[PDB]
Amino acid sequence: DIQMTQSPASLSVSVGETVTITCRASENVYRNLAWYQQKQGKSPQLLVYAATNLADGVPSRFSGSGSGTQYSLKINSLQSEDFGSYFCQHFWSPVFTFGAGTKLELK
Amino acid sequence: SDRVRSITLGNSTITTQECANVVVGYGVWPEYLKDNEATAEDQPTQPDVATCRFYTLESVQWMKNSAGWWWKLPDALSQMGLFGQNMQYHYLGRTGYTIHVQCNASKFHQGCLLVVCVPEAEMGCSNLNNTPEFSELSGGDSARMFTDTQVGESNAKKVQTAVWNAGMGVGVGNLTIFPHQWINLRTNNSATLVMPYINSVPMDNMFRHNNLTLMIIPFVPLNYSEGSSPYVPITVTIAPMCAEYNGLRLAS
Amino acid sequence: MGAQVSTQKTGAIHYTNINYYKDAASNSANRQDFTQDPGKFTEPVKDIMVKTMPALN
Amino acid sequence: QVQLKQSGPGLVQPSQSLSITCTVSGFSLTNYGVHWVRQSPGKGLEWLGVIWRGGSTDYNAAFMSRLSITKDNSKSQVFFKMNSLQADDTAIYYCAKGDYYGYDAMDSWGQGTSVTVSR
Amino acid sequence: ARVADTISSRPTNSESIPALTAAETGHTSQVVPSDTMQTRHVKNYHSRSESSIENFLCRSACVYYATYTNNSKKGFAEWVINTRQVAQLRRKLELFTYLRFDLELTFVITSAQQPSTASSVDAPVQTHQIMYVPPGGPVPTKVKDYAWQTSTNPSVFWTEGNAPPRMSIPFISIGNAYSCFYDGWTQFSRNGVYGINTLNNMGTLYMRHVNEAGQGPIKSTVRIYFKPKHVKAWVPRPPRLCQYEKQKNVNFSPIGVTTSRTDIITT
Amino acid sequence: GLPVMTTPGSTQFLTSDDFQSPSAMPQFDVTPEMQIPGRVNNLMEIAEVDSVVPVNNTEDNVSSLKAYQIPVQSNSDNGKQVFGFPLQPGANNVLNRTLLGEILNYYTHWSGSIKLTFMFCGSAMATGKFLLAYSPPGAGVPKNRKDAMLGTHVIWDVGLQSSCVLCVPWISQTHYRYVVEDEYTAAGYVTCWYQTNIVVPADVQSSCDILCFVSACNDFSVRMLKDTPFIRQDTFYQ
């Protein structure tokens, strides 16, 4: 099948700066990627679908881009309620595989 | 003025205050079946006040990054009142439609739709060996949506919904040869199409043949500055015209 | 019973044609029925609009 | 609008069967498909199986001989069944609907039941 | 069918606006070049004769070819009749939704010698038989069969070296027009097959050698040519952009609308 | 025993002949005709229907709906160019795959005028004026507004009617022109320039889009039917 290698595995940043989380597929998925955000001990929420589009209630700090095999997610101004985990999960082909995981301590 | 219409069918009335002209078929108006072209020998049922009225489908939301929608509509009206009851007890049936897509916004929004109504739209599947199933082709009074990506092929049975190929393998720019109108939010406010019965047989079964497809594709996407209303819906009202049925049987 | 479909395709002369078989699906091709009506694909509009007038009043 | 929720057994003996029933609300099973995702503390997130809106199912490769997902359109419920329940299945199981505007993404997830395979 | 000619124009200053229109009405502008500039009076003698429906479609095109070996068991060809195995005739017929024409068949039969082992191989001229079986009739299963009597099935006999054989077939259908597209299923439960194969019941075409295997095997090849006559067409359609993949359906792979250039202002 | 003599050209198979041939099914009763709406009598009325042309090919917009949209913004200088492409409706990849360019690739010669309908798909409070120029060949493509104003042009004012039709004329030495890329029978260039700026009020998006259509006039003609280069096949489909 196809693996999703996500980098970096962890981050330590403060409130108000610009970060960038990337994840790379094994082969081409044609912009079939979805980004999620999970806080401590609840279900993951959909954040960015189809590698560019924003969800219903997600504010415009989040921005996703990429094409082909290399994709990324960018927050221009990080805020106090936006820590947690982030995964990328392609829906190009069964079996769907999730990302490894990133962690934001917000130090 | 040339911007106001009033359409009255049965016990319903659709009015509009700014609009373009109405496009009618390939030049013909929907009428009944003559005796030169008839092939059945039983007398048809023409209720013509109970089924020739405006049925309003469900509304969809026009987001900024939206791709398109499609209905089928011998099938989208299969649960709507007495039109959906005569389709069940009868074996044959012919009809013509009038379609009214309506979508309003202020003077500070911008966008442009393409309201086209194509006959005999065969759709292509994502998996190259199979044909798409029924629930992925059409929903009863619920829109199926295009995407702007490429649908994967290892799914079981799914329609290829790449919007630039319009699902049928043709260029999406060349869809203007069918009867069509544009809803330009600068000037226009609603589109109206009157379609006759287009088929190679004088009557056909209505549960295994969808001889039309109404597609709505945004060419120039919705955009507005911050402060304007972000929720812009689209509503479609369809009304059959000159409907008749043959072959009365059990319910199915 | 020779049919005279005379006018050949000339630029800017007669020819003969006799049918021999009993089925109408065995004649030659038509090739000379020039008919045009583009008003059903270009102007499929209920209310006719004049060229010189503005389209939206 | 309120959405789907589940109810599971919680604690299961090894080499047994597991069954969580995820019931929905606010929509129909004739328009959306429900996925099944396993959140594991050691192996991370993984996708188990899905039942589409047409009724056909599609399972993972490693969980092929053990998974079986069915549904009922009238009662608006889906059923899942895994068998033989080995030691690494101590995780929390989610049900989540698909087809986010035709894009096959998960929009809303269940509350998740945490299962344990041990004695 | 002469085209319209341009008339002379004058400099104008009025309130009449031929250029400004509204494209939202779904109505193409009917303007001429004598409305936005000054034109001289030229009379056109050009004709639209070669762009007609009859002159566009009534040309012979191959649809299929199959081989069969004389000195071999399983040697005879069969072909269910359909016009969607080639790419160039399928694209021409799919510009319209409904068609109604009369066909005109032509077969081009060739032969080739196979590597036998006998010395001084000498064979006479060969004879071929092409039998057409309507849907429902009995079919042959070998070369020496009872079904090649053709008591009611039409068939043709042809020896090598002469002109190619040629028949003519009227409009055979159940409906009132041939249907190139069909958005529907076969069963009333909306299961099973979906597409254009619900209407494909034109029949089968069986080909065989007549002569016995004398001393050396001979492998023949017959090509079938379709040619529509008396054509009527309804409901035009945008032409096919992506490549064809299968015969039974319209499955495809997505592709761009055009080939790209380096800029928007480049030439 | 009437004496005849067989001329050259006997027992041949020419694929464009009109001869009679014996019927295979005699006295066959056809299915009677029926008035189906939308009968096409000639291929020169399919080409008279307008179709959106993909002007904006930039190597990644061809697999999107951004190929048809021409970006127009509120500038800060005078006389910027909007687009530009040569006028070759059978060889140039802008007008190649439209509804007009897909019929011309079945033929070899063509002659007549071409309409080019634009539509301002912007806001309701935005204004602007544009220049729609067509330059005959012989010189290069015009690079200024002063160079392009000397050809056949029109000035379009955006307003209540949101469409303008630039109709290029038939200016040539020969009665016909080749569909394929030829240097002897070139046809010219079509450009577009800002006349004045695009002025918007407050709280309006200043990035509007423009669609463009293409069709044929009532004196368009084609000749010498050939086969198309857009389709391809390796084996038989099964």
mmCIF file of C-alpha atoms in Angstrom, chain B residues 26 28 37 107-110 112 163-164 172-174 176-177 182 184 186-187 196-197 199 201-202 217-221 223-226, chain F residues 34 37-38 46 49-52 63 65 68-69 97-99 120-126 158-160 162 202-205 207 209 213:
data_model
loop_
_atom_site.group_PDB
_atom_site.id
_atom_site.type_symbol
_atom_site.label_atom_id
_atom_site.label_comp_id
_atom_site.label_asym_id
_atom_site.label_seq_id
_atom_site.Cartn_x
_atom_site.Cartn_y
_atom_site.Cartn_z
ATOM 1 C CA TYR B 26 -35.004 22.815 -28.730
ATOM 2 C CA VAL B 28 -40.752 23.142 -29.088
ATOM 3 C CA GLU B 37 -47.265 8.142 -32.784
ATOM 4 C CA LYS B 107 -24.854 43.870 -4.916
ATOM 5 C CA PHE B 108 -21.569 43.199 -3.096
ATOM 6 C CA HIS B 109 -21.270 39.486 -3.949
ATOM 7 C CA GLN B 110 -19.938 38.001 -7.166
ATOM 8 C CA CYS B 112 -21.590 32.833 -11.908
ATOM 9 C CA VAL B 163 -15.729 18.561 -12.479
ATOM 10 C CA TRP B 164 -13.566 19.607 -15.437
ATOM 11 C CA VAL B 172 -16.920 21.082 -19.376
ATOM 12 C CA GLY B 173 -16.678 24.189 -21.557
ATOM 13 C CA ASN B 174 -18.591 22.504 -24.387
ATOM 14 C CA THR B 176 -23.352 25.015 -23.697
ATOM 15 C CA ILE B 177 -24.699 23.160 -26.740
ATOM 16 C CA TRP B 182 -26.394 31.420 -16.619
ATOM 17 C CA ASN B 184 -24.735 35.832 -13.082
ATOM 18 C CA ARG B 186 -24.254 40.879 -11.065
ATOM 19 C CA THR B 187 -27.415 40.993 -13.219
ATOM 20 C CA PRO B 196 -40.021 18.701 -23.845
ATOM 21 C CA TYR B 197 -40.026 14.892 -23.914
ATOM 22 C CA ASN B 199 -36.621 9.964 -26.120
ATOM 23 C CA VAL B 201 -39.539 5.701 -27.898
ATOM 24 C CA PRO B 202 -42.952 7.400 -27.482
ATOM 25 C CA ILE B 217 -21.597 24.207 -12.145
ATOM 26 C CA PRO B 218 -20.016 27.405 -10.715
ATOM 27 C CA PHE B 219 -17.549 28.712 -13.283
ATOM 28 C CA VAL B 220 -16.588 31.898 -11.417
ATOM 29 C CA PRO B 221 -16.656 31.054 -7.691
ATOM 30 C CA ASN B 223 -16.513 35.777 -3.345
ATOM 31 C CA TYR B 224 -17.331 38.612 -0.967
ATOM 32 C CA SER B 225 -15.582 40.959 1.398
ATOM 33 C CA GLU B 226 -15.713 40.502 5.156
ATOM 34 C CA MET F 34 -41.544 10.079 -34.922
ATOM 35 C CA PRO F 37 -37.105 17.451 -30.908
ATOM 36 C CA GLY F 38 -33.761 18.834 -31.984
ATOM 37 C CA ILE F 46 -23.283 23.060 -34.130
ATOM 38 C CA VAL F 49 -23.271 27.780 -30.685
ATOM 39 C CA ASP F 50 -20.976 29.595 -28.276
ATOM 40 C CA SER F 51 -18.644 27.713 -25.947
ATOM 41 C CA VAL F 52 -16.284 28.831 -23.198
ATOM 42 C CA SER F 63 -6.881 20.223 -14.801
ATOM 43 C CA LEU F 65 -11.970 25.160 -13.679
ATOM 44 C CA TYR F 68 -11.706 29.496 -18.320
ATOM 45 C CA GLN F 69 -11.291 32.465 -15.962
ATOM 46 C CA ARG F 97 -10.716 21.981 -27.975
ATOM 47 C CA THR F 98 -13.748 24.291 -28.044
ATOM 48 C CA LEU F 99 -16.977 23.486 -29.875
ATOM 49 C CA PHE F 120 -17.882 40.431 -17.029
ATOM 50 C CA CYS F 121 -18.525 38.010 -14.163
ATOM 51 C CA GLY F 122 -17.728 40.495 -11.422
ATOM 52 C CA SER F 123 -19.486 42.493 -8.744
ATOM 53 C CA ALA F 124 -22.466 44.773 -9.270
ATOM 54 C CA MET F 125 -20.756 47.964 -8.042
ATOM 55 C CA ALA F 126 -17.569 47.635 -10.110
ATOM 56 C CA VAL F 158 -19.116 47.548 -18.412
ATOM 57 C CA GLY F 159 -22.643 48.265 -17.224
ATOM 58 C CA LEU F 160 -26.183 46.885 -17.248
ATOM 59 C CA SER F 162 -22.659 42.653 -19.276
ATOM 60 C CA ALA F 202 -15.255 49.920 -0.127
ATOM 61 C CA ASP F 203 -15.935 46.352 1.096
ATOM 62 C CA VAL F 204 -15.963 44.970 -2.470
ATOM 63 C CA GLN F 205 -13.479 42.388 -3.726
ATOM 64 C CA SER F 207 -10.357 40.789 -8.205
ATOM 65 C CA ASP F 209 -13.109 37.495 -13.518
ATOM 66 C CA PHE F 213 -17.002 32.653 -25.700
#
